[PDB]
Structure formats: structure tokens, C-alpha cells
């Protein structure tokens, strides 16, 4: 029998979600199982669990980000440059590969959306505007990004059937780690600026692996290895949400652990 909102809310409370919390979810809907009214049921449950003073932050990205098409070029290739749609935060769909729940989150009434087309973040709650801006090219997941503010805002990472590789916030640890050999990428995104499409080319840390040994396409990347180690070494509330094994992680703690983990393994 499909899970009801009420059942999910009680499960979230059992896991340690409290009214007022700042939560970043990572969800496998297949692990959760059928929901009374589909994925919206879990969105509604998350919003009810954090309450009217709580906040939700999600990494939603963009279905049509021209990342691969512009990667490694000093400018968007001509055919891309001419016809790609500008990123419109009000209308651009979420990237399906990071979770089907994210399109439900970003279309929720009052949801705010960050301006970085590839790293785009969606937030619901009284602090949503403060969370989502600024979000500039060159600051995808590190200092000055929504993740940086989430980490200063008592953020909790709510992993609902998701693996250790899913913990986006650990890209912050990669950005700030004082280690040699860090990989960077260059790409171009089409932004809206006063109603006009403007191509912006930037470099940033490689979010597919901060060092060569973490950058195999299949992984494991550093995020995965850090989070696996962390979860083997830390008390973290665990329990079901729907049918999914779930965990509620203190974001500042896991990111601090990850900075230390990288700096202990790689020379400065
Ligand atoms: N490296 C191993 C990891 O790879 C993916 O996760 C990474 C995405 O690939 C990145 O996405 C970027 O690169 C994609 C592929 O080029 C583009 O499509 C996309 N627009 C870009 O934002 C994202 N920023 C960080 C995320 N950790 C898998 O999901 C994850 O399970 C696995 O551990
Ligand atoms: Mg508040």
C-alpha cells in the first residue's frame, strides 16, 4: 500500500528532522516505493516536517545544461552559441539524472532558484532568497555558493535511499582543500541578463573528480570515498523513509571531515 504524507512525516520525525531545520535531500524514488500521490507526497512531507520556519535546499541543475557541449573550449562552439536556450530560472526544468523529485521541488509555489545554470539550486522556505543568491559562474559548490551558506545555516543532509556518492555538499570540501594537483574545468553557460542571452565562460573545480585518481567516469570519486569513510566512523541517525534506508547527516561535520580527509592524503 502506497505511503501517505502522514506516514512519511512521522518517519522523518523519527529520523531526527525537526521543525525549523535546514535540510538538503538526496532521494532515490525507487527505494522509497509507491507514494499516495506520487513524488509530490514526499515533497509535501518534507515541507511539513521542516515546518513554516524550516528550509529545503536541493541541487536541481538544468535538464539542458550545455556542459559537455562546451567543456574544454575557450568559447561555446558556434552551433551551440547560436541556438542554445538561455537559462531561465523560472522555466528551465531540473536535470532528471540527479533525481526525479527535483522537478517537483523546483516547481513548488514560492520555490526560489539559483542563477548558476549547471549548479542550479532550488530552495523553499523563509531563507530561500538568502540561500540561492549569489550563485555566480566560477562558484558552483565552493565558497560564496548556496552550499557555502547551507553549511553556515545548520544544514542537515537527508539521504533517502541514496548512496555515499550523492552528497553534493562534499564538493565544497574539494573546492577548499589545500592539496596539490586539483583539477579544473572550463565551460560556458548561456545566462539571461536584462532579458538578453549572454554567454559566460568560466573555470571552476572539476566536480567529476578533484584529482586524477578520483576522476574515472565510473568513480569512485572523492565524494563517495569520503562519505563512505565518514559513515563507517560516525553516529548518524538511520531509519526508513517510505521503503528507503535513510540517514540524516550534519552537513558541517561531514564537510569538515572531508577537508581533513583530503588534506591528510594529499600533499599541500
Ligand atoms: N564523478 C562521479 C559522479 O558522477 C556523477 O555525479 C557528478 C555529476 O556528474 C556532476 O555533473 C557535471 O558533469 C556532468 C557529466 O558531464 C554533467 O552532465 C552535469 N551537467 C555537470 O554538472 C555534478 N556536478 C557533480 C556530481 N558529483 C554521478 O551522478 C555520481 O553518482 C558519481 O559519483
Ligand atoms: Mg529561519
Amino acid at each position: 500500500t502506497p505511503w501517505s504524507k502522514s506516514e512519511l512525516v512521522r518517519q522523518l520525525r523519527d529520523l531526527g528532522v525537526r521543525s525549523g531545520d535546514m535540510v538538503m535531500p538526496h532521494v532515490s524514488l525507487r527505494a522509497v516505493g509507491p507514494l499516495a500521490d506520487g513524488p509530490q507526497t514526499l515533497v509535501d512531507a518534507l515541507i511539513e516536517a521542516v515546518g513554516p520556519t524550516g528550509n529545503i535546499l536541493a541541487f536541481v541543475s538544468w535538464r539542458d545544461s550545455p556542459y559537455e557541449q562546451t567543456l574544454g573550449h575557450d568559447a561555446p562552439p558556434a552551433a551551440i552559441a547560436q541556438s542554445w536556450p538561455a537559462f531561465d530560472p523560472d522555466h528551465a526544468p531540473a536535470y532528471p539524472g540527479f533525481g526525479a523529485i527535483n522537478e517537483f521541488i523546483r516547481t513548488y509555489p514560492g520555490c526560489r532558484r539559483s542563477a548558476h545554470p549547471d549548479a542550479s539550486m532550488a530552495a523553499i522556505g523563509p531563507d530561500a532568497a538568502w540561500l540561492v543568491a549569489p550563485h555566480e559562474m566560477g562558484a558552483a559548490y565552493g565558497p560564496r555558493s548556496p552550499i557555502a551558506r547551507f553549511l553556515a545555516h545548520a544544514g542537515k543532509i537527508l539521504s533517502i535511499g541514496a548512496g555515499p556518492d550523492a552528497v553534493t555538499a562534499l564538493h565544497y570540501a574539494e573546492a577548499v582543500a589545500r592539496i596539490e594537483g586539483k583539477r579544473r574545468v572550463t565551460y560556458s553557460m548561456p545566462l539571461l541578463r536584462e532579458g538578453k542571452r549572454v554567454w559566460v565562460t568560466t573555470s571552476d573545480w572539476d566536480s567529476n573528480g578533484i584529482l586524477d585518481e578520483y576522476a574515472a567516469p565510473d568513480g569512485p570519486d572523492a565524494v563517495e570515498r569520503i562519505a563512505r569513510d565518514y559513515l563507517a566512523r560516525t553516529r548518524v541517525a538511520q531509519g526508513p523513509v517510505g521503503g528507503a534506508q535513510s540517514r540524516l547527516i550534519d552537513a558541517a561535520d561531514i564537510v569538515s571531515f572531508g577537508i581533513e580527509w583530503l588534506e591528510a592524503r594529499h600533499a599541500a
Side-chain angles (χ1 to χ4, degrees), residues 30 69-70 115 130 138 147 160 168 214 216 225 242 244 262 268:
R30 203 166 339 268
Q69 298 86 344
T70 66
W130 175 81
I147 297 291
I160 295 167
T168 311
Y214 301 123
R225 297 179 60 182
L262 291 165

Side-chain angles (χ1 to χ4, degrees), residues 158-264:
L158 170 58
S159 172
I160 295 167
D165 61 293
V167 185
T168 311
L170 277 169
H171 297 304
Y172 182 98
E174 294 179 322
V176 303
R178 295 168 173 175
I179 64 179
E180 61 185 8
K182 295 165 73 169
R183 290 168 57 102
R184 296 184 62 81
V185 289
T186 295
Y187 53 86
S188 300
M189 293 289 133
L191 304 183
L192 279 173
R193 284 180 176 172
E194 290 160 25
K196 324 225 164 306
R197 181 187 59 184
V198 178
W199 282 100
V200 176
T201 303
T202 194
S203 66
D204 212 337
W205 307 114
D206 189 350
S207 68
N208 284 306
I210 194 62
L211 301 182
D212 294 339
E213 62 197 89
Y214 301 123
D218 292 327
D221 75 339
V223 171
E224 183 174 344
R225 297 179 60 182
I226 294 167
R228 267 188 215 288
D229 265 357
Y230 182 83
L231 292 173
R233 289 170 177 250
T234 310
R235 287 185 72 175
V236 174
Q238 295 154 62
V241 177
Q245 290 146 260
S246 304
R247 297 136 298 259
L248 192 60
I249 295 164
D250 184 90
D253 193 57
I254 195 171
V255 168
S256 293
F257 178 92
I259 297 169
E260 291 173 16
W261 189 98
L262 291 165
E263 289 176 0

Side-chain angles (χ1 to χ4, degrees), residues 22-89:
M22 164 82 267
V23 174
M24 177 168 194
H26 298 298
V27 183
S28 171
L29 289 167
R30 203 166 339 268
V32 168
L35 298 170
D37 294 290
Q40 187 70 41
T41 298
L42 180 58
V43 175
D44 293 337
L46 292 168
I47 293 169
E48 181 164 323
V50 302
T53 73
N55 298 273
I56 295 166
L57 180 69
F59 171 37
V60 308
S61 186
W62 178 20
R63 186 190 74 180
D64 303 319
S65 175
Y67 186 90
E68 296 97 347
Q69 298 86 344
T70 66
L71 186 60
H73 300 280
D74 55 11
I80 300 299
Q82 174 168 227
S83 66
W84 211 269
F87 179 69
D88 185 334

